[PDB]
Symmetry: C3
Subunit: 332 residues, 3 copies
């Protein structure tokens, strides 16, 4: 059974096919690829674009999406094995995935880390459990990676430059400020797809404590050696931005501080100058700027940058709809 | 771009066309006016009829409604401009409206005042922001006015009297009791449409403190001079009800007490006799009674009045579906 | 007007017709029985299978389900008559049911007891009120009985044994452990349908305090005399399980302790050995095991039992979709 858990699991040819089908769907939005079919959208965390785009995507292809929120409307779910369920969880994922598999044709799942212990969060237990027990394809709607975002982002870049080949472009993945410590998922995914696409990637972050999990740094290294791109880490803003063709910003909590955030608060607070403003963008090669959203204006990026004609964030957001339709079509 | 924010923004001819299309849709509920199209229903407050009628209306016309609740499932939204978003809000309406505009064909928004400062609530910031940033038509699902309710109400009245021309009828908009201070929206809208329709309107309320915002009293004055109706404020129950053809009740907090409600509590509590009962309705010219709902029985109106054959509240509620379908059809 | 409140209200012929239509729908899932029609799914409590199966069932038959949660998105509802609504409830069921009746073609309602006073909960006020005031058919999505579960369960059994005739089979309805006191609905329904089907039923529970309400014991007695089955209560595990063809487990709070649960805690806690494990199932005649779900593994039933080929819980869960489609088709 084929699932869409990570782009890293897919061959470059398969990903190129997905991006092309996405472009095709963007030209002809209504279809029958999902006629009479359905997808269960399981959300363990908030969402506006993901829920809306998947729900509309299902509708536009003749199917139907059922939106579920365990702990809210649906019953809370247990993922650990062999435990005595006398706690807060009401049922086990074994039953949840098997039951949904009798109803729907696809299952999407969104589950952010708990931010208590990265050793536990990095195992991707929720997503892996759905893929293990589900008799139908499972789609990652964001856990510790965000593959749907990767493709929406990639398509937006190929559209901007007018070509599917992004090799040679200088890509800057920069950490940015935020009052709270967030998920590294989008950053992990950006690093992954940017290198898979063969760009010259620079991971710009405040300190070594903000470097991404080795798993993704390794994927990136492997992707560069295969795509012909490059990878490097930087703690110097001006050098990183210089000559950049693309700048993608995202805020995330330092992995070393999982379960111990109050000491990280003062640390991030002394780097709010990482905010993407006109000055930094002016150092780029008339580069484009994007963000996965939701975005806090004048915190992660300034009003000027967001409203500049070089910001393609709205186009990338729109593309979530198109690439997800390609993903669902491919899996059914 | 044409939006449906207030009936006051529309010409009488346009409103008559809407009411006629609504009557047509009531005769032939299924259609293809929204085939393959979608509407985002953004709710910042509770709703039963509005969510249900819009959702079903979209379905019946071949489209699909996506229901969103910022702060619940969707991310909280910032509306103020140029501020540093380090608070509770996660994203700005500029991005929210632009993104939704890439997904849906229409956006409906429900956002009640915050009841802290009427000077701020009366600006209609949420609705105006959606209309400003959205590339697609925006529909008022109730903010400080409730135009969809106005048309459902108007159609019910024209149906009751068997004619679209309501000129000459004595219309009584009466305040009624409620344990809590509520939105003036429905009252503002009733005053607006009743005068736009050319009826002889009487705004019956306990004291001058309960008179509606000048904005609506002015709209009413302008509407009367154009429709041939009349407007007057009253604090005397029996004189107002006498010979009335229509009685529309709604409870609302006195505008002067925004941000200072505890002193208003004792005030409203001494006027619970404003409740619509058989005695008051017996003073009317065999008039009809209606309410926008939800309604607290034996508080806002008695069981007898609600169950009387003169109560058209259920018909008005049904009409929300028909007039909203006419509105969506007109905007697409 | 015909509603689906309880199987006990339906003749055996009508129920057999429903089960047969359910089997037919399971073979041909897409249809037009609900084309352009809609159902309002009103949930006062959590749900995963019920919401998902009804929503998908409506979609597969060409209709649309509107999911409502009073107190969450919809307004809270008052059911008592003639009271002064100055409390938490915003509107009365009289208005709610009448309004929904102008929008949808069917109304489903889920409302568990409040667990404070069984004398009040056993009256089934919510369900009865919807049936009383609704101009359209009402469907029980679980209140104090769970008729939809009864049919899904019955169909799964007929499928397992390869025949609609279950007479002669030894059926064991056993109480099982759970940290909290739960609804007797599923148990009441199991007892009802198992006897209606003519099986030899044994109600196995810890003590006389866990025996079901007389109403259901009476229905069972009446069903046995008509179907040719049998009914008996047992407090001995091994004797009950011996030679059983079917074992259905469910946990529920002792009726005598409604409104007084802390003293019941120690009582249930001394019977957690009622859990369905391999040892008890090995005493049966290679019998099948099922549960309505959600199920707490290693509490209500062990991992071994849940994963055994004799467990048909997933099939019963799937059948909720098919029997509910038969129910909606029959009522429209
Ligand atoms: C603040 C916060 O927690 N952010 C998330 C955004 C995820 C990407 N964004 C999306 O998928 C868009 P939507 O479907 O509207 O959430 C994060 O940090 O990973
Ligand atoms: C108590 C309360 O806050 N009431 C609202 C009712 C609005 C009109 N009513 C509707 O639009 C019907 P529904 O869509 O079911 O809310 C108010 O006072 O403005
Ligand atoms: C723990 C709890 O409260 N359980 C419920 C389960 C009801 C039957 N189960 C269903 O209808 C399945 P779903 O639609 O997913 O809830 C009870 O005890 O009655």
């Amino acid at each position: 059974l084929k699932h869409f858990l990570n782009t890293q699991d897919w061959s470059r040819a398969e990903l190129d096919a997905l991006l092309t089908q996405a472009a095709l769907f963007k030209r002809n939005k209504l279809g029958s690829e999902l006629k009479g079919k359905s997808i269960a959208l399981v959300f363990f965390n908030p969402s506006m674009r993901t829920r809306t785009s998947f729900e509309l995507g299902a509708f536009q292809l003749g199917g139907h999406a059922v939106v579920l929120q365990p702990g809210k409307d649906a019953w809370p779910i247990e993922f650990n094995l062999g435990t005595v369920m006398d706690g807060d969880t009401e049922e086990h994922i074994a039953e949840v995935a098997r039951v949904l598999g009798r109803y729907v044709d696809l299952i999407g799942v969104r589950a952010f880390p708990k931010f208590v212990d990265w050793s536990k969060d990095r195992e991707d237990q929720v997503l892996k459990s759905f893929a293990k027990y589900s008799p139908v394809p499972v789609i990652n709607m964001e856990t510790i990676t965000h593959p749907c975002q990767e493709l929406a982002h990639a398509l937006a870049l190929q559209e901007h430059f007018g070509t599917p080949d992004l090799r040679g472009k200088k890509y800057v993945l920069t950490w940015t400020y935020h009052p709270k410590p967030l998920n590294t998922a989008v950053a992990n995914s950006a690093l992954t797809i940017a290198t898979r696409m063969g760009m010259d990637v620079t991971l710009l972050c405040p300190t070594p404590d903000y470097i991404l999990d080795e798993r993704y740094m390794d994927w990136a290294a492997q992707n560069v050696a295969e795509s012909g791109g490059s990878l490097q880490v930087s703690h110097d803003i001006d050098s990183a931005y210089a000559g950049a063709d693309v700048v993608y910003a995202k805020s995330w909590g330092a992995l070393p501080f999982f379960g111990n955030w109050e000491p990280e608060k003062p640390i991030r607070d002394q780097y709010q100058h990482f905010i993407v403003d006109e000055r930094k963008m002016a150092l780029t090669n008339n580069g484009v700027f994007s963000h996965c959203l939701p975005l806090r204006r004048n915190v992660e990026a300034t009003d000027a940058v967001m409203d500049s004609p070089n910001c393609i964030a709205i186009d990338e957001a729109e593309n979530r709809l198109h690439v997800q339709k390609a993903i669902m079509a491919a899996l059914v």
